[PDB]
PDB file of C-alpha atoms in Angstrom:
ATOM      1  CA  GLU A  26       0.000   0.000   0.000  1.00 55.69           C
ATOM      2  CA  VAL A  27       2.833   2.370   0.902  1.00 56.78           C
ATOM      3  CA  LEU A  28       6.076   1.191  -0.683  1.00 56.88           C
ATOM      4  CA  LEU A  29       9.311   1.779   1.228  1.00 58.77           C
ATOM      5  CA  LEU A  30      11.432  -0.012  -1.362  1.00 58.79           C
ATOM      6  CA  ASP A  31      10.704  -1.370  -4.810  1.00 56.10           C
ATOM      7  CA  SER A  32      13.652  -2.906  -6.662  1.00 57.42           C
ATOM      8  CA  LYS A  33      11.575  -2.712  -9.862  1.00 54.60           C
ATOM      9  CA  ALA A  34      10.931   1.048  -9.502  1.00 51.61           C
ATOM     10  CA  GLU A  35      23.891  -0.898  -7.359  1.00 53.64           C
ATOM     11  CA  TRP A  36      23.593  -2.701  -4.003  1.00 56.26           C
ATOM     12  CA  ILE A  37      26.684  -3.850  -2.072  1.00 55.40           C
ATOM     13  CA  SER A  38      28.179  -7.310  -2.558  1.00 54.55           C
ATOM     14  CA  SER A  39      30.667  -8.729  -0.058  1.00 55.29           C
ATOM     15  CA  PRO A  40      32.612 -10.295  -1.570  1.00 53.00           C
ATOM     16  CA  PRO A  41      31.988  -8.464  -4.899  1.00 54.40           C
ATOM     17  CA  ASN A  42      32.596 -11.785  -6.714  1.00 57.44           C
ATOM     18  CA  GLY A  43      29.706 -13.529  -4.906  1.00 56.02           C
ATOM     19  CA  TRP A  44      26.265 -12.041  -5.539  1.00 57.09           C
ATOM     20  CA  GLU A  45      26.417 -10.381  -8.951  1.00 59.36           C
ATOM     21  CA  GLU A  46      24.007  -7.993 -10.634  1.00 56.76           C
ATOM     22  CA  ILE A  47      22.636  -9.264 -13.948  1.00 56.80           C
ATOM     23  CA  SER A  48      20.251  -7.054 -15.923  1.00 56.42           C
ATOM     24  CA  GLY A  49      17.702  -7.404 -18.707  1.00 59.42           C
ATOM     25  CA  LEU A  50      14.460  -5.993 -20.071  1.00 60.43           C
ATOM     26  CA  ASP A  51      10.719  -6.715 -19.737  1.00 60.70           C
ATOM     27  CA  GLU A  52       8.280  -7.376 -22.561  1.00 59.50           C
ATOM     28  CA  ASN A  53       7.328  -3.726 -22.026  1.00 61.08           C
ATOM     29  CA  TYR A  54      10.977  -2.603 -21.745  1.00 61.26           C
ATOM     30  CA  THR A  55      11.065  -2.145 -17.965  1.00 64.25           C
ATOM     31  CA  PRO A  56      14.535  -2.921 -16.549  1.00 63.48           C
ATOM     32  CA  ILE A  57      14.922  -6.191 -14.674  1.00 64.94           C
ATOM     33  CA  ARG A  58      17.696  -6.090 -12.095  1.00 65.70           C
ATOM     34  CA  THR A  59      18.536  -9.477 -10.616  1.00 68.41           C
ATOM     35  CA  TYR A  60      21.242 -10.531  -8.210  1.00 64.72           C
ATOM     36  CA  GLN A  61      22.627 -13.995  -8.781  1.00 63.09           C
ATOM     37  CA  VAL A  62      25.064 -16.399  -7.170  1.00 62.10           C
ATOM     38  CA  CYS A  63      25.764 -20.076  -7.893  1.00 63.94           C
ATOM     39  CA  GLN A  64      29.055 -21.021  -6.184  1.00 64.05           C
ATOM     40  CA  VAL A  65      27.864 -24.567  -5.502  1.00 61.71           C
ATOM     41  CA  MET A  66      31.221 -26.266  -6.193  1.00 60.73           C
ATOM     42  CA  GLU A  67      33.311 -24.109  -3.819  1.00 59.40           C
ATOM     43  CA  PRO A  68      33.392 -24.785  -0.039  1.00 58.68           C
ATOM     44  CA  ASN A  69      32.594 -22.366   2.838  1.00 55.17           C
ATOM     45  CA  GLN A  70      30.453 -19.813   0.970  1.00 53.63           C
ATOM     46  CA  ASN A  71      29.621 -16.606   2.856  1.00 56.59           C
ATOM     47  CA  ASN A  72      28.239 -14.299   0.156  1.00 57.79           C
ATOM     48  CA  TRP A  73      26.454 -11.161   1.356  1.00 60.95           C
ATOM     49  CA  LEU A  74      24.220  -8.770  -0.542  1.00 60.92           C
ATOM     50  CA  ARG A  75      22.880  -5.624   1.130  1.00 59.76           C
ATOM     51  CA  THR A  76      20.231  -3.175  -0.069  1.00 62.03           C
ATOM     52  CA  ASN A  77      20.351   0.622   0.129  1.00 62.55           C
ATOM     53  CA  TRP A  78      19.247   2.212   3.405  1.00 61.13           C
ATOM     54  CA  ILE A  79      15.474   2.073   3.776  1.00 58.37           C
ATOM     55  CA  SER A  80      13.553   4.829   5.562  1.00 58.30           C
ATOM     56  CA  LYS A  81      10.644   3.302   7.506  1.00 59.08           C
ATOM     57  CA  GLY A  82       8.465   6.428   7.155  1.00 55.18           C
ATOM     58  CA  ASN A  83       5.217   6.198   9.124  1.00 54.91           C
ATOM     59  CA  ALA A  84       5.365   2.377   9.176  1.00 56.72           C
ATOM     60  CA  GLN A  85       4.739   0.193  12.189  1.00 57.02           C
ATOM     61  CA  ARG A  86       4.773  -3.407  10.941  1.00 56.87           C
ATOM     62  CA  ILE A  87       6.746  -3.881   7.718  1.00 55.46           C
ATOM     63  CA  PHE A  88       6.451  -6.525   4.977  1.00 53.82           C
ATOM     64  CA  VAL A  89       9.357  -7.793   2.860  1.00 51.55           C
ATOM     65  CA  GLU A  90       8.553  -9.652  -0.385  1.00 53.86           C
ATOM     66  CA  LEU A  91      11.212 -11.675  -2.180  1.00 55.99           C
ATOM     67  CA  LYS A  92      10.882 -13.245  -5.602  1.00 59.56           C
ATOM     68  CA  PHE A  93      13.618 -15.680  -6.562  1.00 59.84           C
ATOM     69  CA  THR A  94      14.508 -18.889  -8.366  1.00 55.57           C
ATOM     70  CA  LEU A  95      16.502 -21.571  -6.577  1.00 52.40           C
ATOM     71  CA  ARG A  96      17.905 -24.705  -8.255  1.00 54.18           C
ATOM     72  CA  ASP A  97      17.442 -28.147  -6.736  1.00 54.63           C
ATOM     73  CA  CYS A  98      20.927 -29.461  -5.917  1.00 55.72           C
ATOM     74  CA  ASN A  99      19.880 -32.695  -7.684  1.00 59.34           C
ATOM     75  CA  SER A 100      19.632 -30.828 -11.017  1.00 58.74           C
ATOM     76  CA  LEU A 101      23.138 -29.321 -10.884  1.00 59.23           C
ATOM     77  CA  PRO A 102      25.603 -31.443 -12.919  1.00 58.46           C
ATOM     78  CA  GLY A 103      27.259 -33.704 -10.322  1.00 58.26           C
ATOM     79  CA  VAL A 104      28.099 -30.996  -7.781  1.00 56.11           C
ATOM     80  CA  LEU A 105      27.556 -33.005  -4.547  1.00 55.60           C
ATOM     81  CA  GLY A 106      29.232 -32.002  -1.261  1.00 58.85           C
ATOM     82  CA  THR A 107      27.986 -28.777   0.279  1.00 59.36           C
ATOM     83  CA  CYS A 108      25.169 -27.634  -2.033  1.00 62.77           C
ATOM     84  CA  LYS A 109      22.292 -25.783  -0.356  1.00 62.04           C
ATOM     85  CA  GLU A 110      18.638 -25.128  -1.208  1.00 59.68           C
ATOM     86  CA  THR A 111      18.017 -22.145   1.082  1.00 60.03           C
ATOM     87  CA  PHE A 112      19.464 -18.688   1.793  1.00 61.43           C
ATOM     88  CA  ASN A 113      19.291 -16.349   4.798  1.00 62.59           C
ATOM     89  CA  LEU A 114      17.404 -13.066   5.166  1.00 61.35           C
ATOM     90  CA  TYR A 115      18.952 -10.494   7.521  1.00 59.37           C
ATOM     91  CA  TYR A 116      18.453  -6.898   8.622  1.00 56.38           C
ATOM     92  CA  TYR A 117      20.156  -4.108  10.543  1.00 59.36           C
ATOM     93  CA  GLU A 118      18.412  -1.014  11.949  1.00 61.16           C
ATOM     94  CA  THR A 119      20.079   2.417  11.732  1.00 60.82           C
ATOM     95  CA  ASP A 120      18.809   5.989  12.074  1.00 62.45           C
ATOM     96  CA  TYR A 121      20.802   7.101   9.021  1.00 60.31           C
ATOM     97  CA  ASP A 122      22.503   5.796   5.883  1.00 59.59           C
ATOM     98  CA  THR A 123      25.895   4.903   7.358  1.00 58.37           C
ATOM     99  CA  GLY A 124      27.713   4.116   4.083  1.00 56.40           C
ATOM    100  CA  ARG A 125      28.637   1.205   1.845  1.00 56.93           C
ATOM    101  CA  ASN A 126      30.269  -1.167   4.355  1.00 59.25           C
ATOM    102  CA  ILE A 127      28.694  -4.483   5.377  1.00 61.37           C
ATOM    103  CA  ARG A 128      29.708  -5.322   8.939  1.00 65.43           C
ATOM    104  CA  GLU A 129      28.186  -8.804   8.972  1.00 65.18           C
ATOM    105  CA  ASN A 130      28.162  -9.155  12.786  1.00 62.60           C
ATOM    106  CA  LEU A 131      25.633  -6.309  13.119  1.00 60.82           C
ATOM    107  CA  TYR A 132      22.952  -8.092  11.070  1.00 59.93           C
ATOM    108  CA  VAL A 133      20.083  -9.916  12.771  1.00 57.61           C
ATOM    109  CA  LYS A 134      18.558 -12.978  11.090  1.00 56.87           C
ATOM    110  CA  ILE A 135      14.921 -12.653  10.077  1.00 56.45           C
ATOM    111  CA  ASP A 136      14.524 -16.159   8.579  1.00 55.97           C
ATOM    112  CA  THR A 137      15.733 -18.977   6.339  1.00 59.43           C
ATOM    113  CA  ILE A 138      14.201 -18.623   2.851  1.00 59.38           C
ATOM    114  CA  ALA A 139      13.184 -21.712   0.882  1.00 55.98           C
ATOM    115  CA  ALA A 140      11.775 -22.446  -2.587  1.00 59.88           C
ATOM    116  CA  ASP A 141       8.304 -23.945  -3.043  1.00 61.43           C
ATOM    117  CA  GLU A 142       8.241 -27.763  -2.937  1.00 61.74           C
ATOM    118  CA  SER A 143       9.187 -29.204  -6.356  1.00 57.46           C
ATOM    119  CA  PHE A 144       9.095 -33.010  -5.842  1.00 58.01           C
ATOM    120  CA  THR A 145       5.380 -33.225  -6.756  1.00 56.22           C
ATOM    121  CA  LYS A 146       9.487 -22.003 -10.767  1.00 57.21           C
ATOM    122  CA  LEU A 147       9.405 -18.383  -9.525  1.00 59.04           C
ATOM    123  CA  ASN A 148       9.056 -18.394  -5.723  1.00 59.22           C
ATOM    124  CA  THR A 149       7.482 -15.656  -3.610  1.00 58.20           C
ATOM    125  CA  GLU A 150       8.221 -15.371   0.108  1.00 58.27           C
ATOM    126  CA  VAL A 151       6.935 -12.675   2.459  1.00 55.38           C
ATOM    127  CA  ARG A 152       8.204 -11.865   5.954  1.00 57.23           C
ATOM    128  CA  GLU A 153       6.775  -9.358   8.434  1.00 58.36           C
ATOM    129  CA  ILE A 154       9.224  -7.422  10.648  1.00 54.47           C
ATOM    130  CA  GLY A 155       8.997  -4.553  13.130  1.00 52.55           C
ATOM    131  CA  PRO A 156       7.886  -2.298  14.613  1.00 52.93           C
ATOM    132  CA  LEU A 157      11.380  -0.827  14.206  1.00 53.24           C
ATOM    133  CA  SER A 158      12.934   1.363  16.896  1.00 50.04           C
ATOM    134  CA  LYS A 159      15.278   3.214  14.488  1.00 53.32           C
ATOM    135  CA  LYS A 160      14.404   5.557  11.576  1.00 54.79           C
ATOM    136  CA  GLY A 161      15.513   3.034   8.938  1.00 55.04           C
ATOM    137  CA  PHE A 162      17.191  -0.269   8.091  1.00 55.98           C
ATOM    138  CA  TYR A 163      19.181  -2.329   5.602  1.00 60.74           C
ATOM    139  CA  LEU A 164      18.091  -5.743   4.365  1.00 60.56           C
ATOM    140  CA  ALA A 165      20.766  -8.317   3.585  1.00 63.36           C
ATOM    141  CA  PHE A 166      20.860 -11.731   1.899  1.00 62.22           C
ATOM    142  CA  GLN A 167      23.430 -14.339   2.855  1.00 62.64           C
ATOM    143  CA  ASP A 168      24.155 -17.177   0.455  1.00 63.49           C
ATOM    144  CA  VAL A 169      25.956 -20.201   1.850  1.00 63.01           C
ATOM    145  CA  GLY A 170      26.301 -22.322  -1.318  1.00 65.60           C
ATOM    146  CA  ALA A 171      23.045 -22.258  -3.272  1.00 67.29           C
ATOM    147  CA  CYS A 172      22.123 -21.470  -6.869  1.00 67.36           C
ATOM    148  CA  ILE A 173      19.919 -18.399  -6.583  1.00 67.48           C
ATOM    149  CA  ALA A 174      18.511 -15.653  -8.760  1.00 69.12           C
ATOM    150  CA  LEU A 175      16.992 -12.900  -6.620  1.00 70.33           C
ATOM    151  CA  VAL A 176      14.549 -11.270  -9.013  1.00 66.80           C
ATOM    152  CA  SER A 177      12.786  -8.630  -6.913  1.00 68.54           C
ATOM    153  CA  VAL A 178      12.597  -7.145  -3.432  1.00 68.76           C
ATOM    154  CA  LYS A 179       9.639  -5.063  -2.274  1.00 67.02           C
ATOM    155  CA  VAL A 180       9.254  -3.509   1.152  1.00 67.66           C
ATOM    156  CA  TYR A 181       5.918  -2.010   2.159  1.00 66.69           C
ATOM    157  CA  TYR A 182       3.498  -1.255   4.987  1.00 68.86           C
ATOM    158  CA  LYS A 183      -0.285  -0.958   5.307  1.00 69.46           C
ATOM    159  CA  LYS A 184      -2.951   1.368   6.792  1.00 69.25           C
TER     160      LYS A 184
END
């Protein structure tokens, strides 16, 4: 109802070689900005992606909507080992935009994010956070060895 962030209306990667921005166009020529990572054959993945600072405005409870694809580890060509089928959603509250650094220890886990069941394509997961005590916040996404395309992020509140 009131949008705080709409990724369809560049974010920080740590390391920069992990989550990577990959762009395209809609059928009606709207930019598509995705962030993708698929380091499924390398051990000990800790790939962080952080949004811009988000002002909470007059929000109390806040909703975060993620749209993403996520490959079944069974479909990836003989990868084995430490392949994952989830990623982690994090946030950190600040009163002001503090700059481009991701100090990972400051981030608080919201939830593990999983794809829809496939053993029976584009997944949509919503989490509700807040009320927040600070004026704003960053969202972050931690990949630990999955094959993910993060297609859109929307942050909004109601009434």
